[PDB]
Amino acid sequence: SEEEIREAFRVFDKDGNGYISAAELRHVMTNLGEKLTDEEVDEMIREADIDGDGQVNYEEFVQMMTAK
Template identity: 50%
Template sequence: MDEETRRIFNKFDINGDGKISSSELKKMLLTLDSKTTSKEIKRIMAELDKNGDGYIDLKEFADFHQSGGDKLADSRELRDAFDLYDLDKNGLISVTELHAVLRKLGEKRSLSDCRKIISSVDTDGDGNVNFEEFKRMMTRA
């Protein structure tokens, strides 16, 4: 398991008990200004909680994070993830939107870092990431 997956998991695992509860998932999504409903939280939990214990453990999270991309290529979850970053809802993730979301997540990245991230996936060269570019990035093996 890579360090990035563990770091993201730890951000969601607010109380540090090694598992993500539905309330922790909801709290993190609210931090990101997501309008996720309780029904959607239950659906996400059911999808990720493979052993049915009511929590998402690190292994379940890693399985989703590392191999889930192919299964999610056209799913609502991938669109929801894109929408978390597309703050102005114009269908593009800009450098400043990426920077703002990463700051909310506690990531200390500069605008220059965000420009590099965007340019690494910006295949059409417009300086933004559209949904297709985001989808390719998220479903890379």
């Protein structure tokens, strides 16, 4: 089900903008117990972002969750 992906997205978004920024992403990661540096966090975005905007959109979010 893709609901799992939507659920994860809902947990990531901190307002309902539909565009997960590095700040919101880091917030969730830190809450999970993952303490990474500025570079490490940005790297995650740089790999997920295919457009090259500086954030992860719904489409890219779905692809990253299905990555292998």
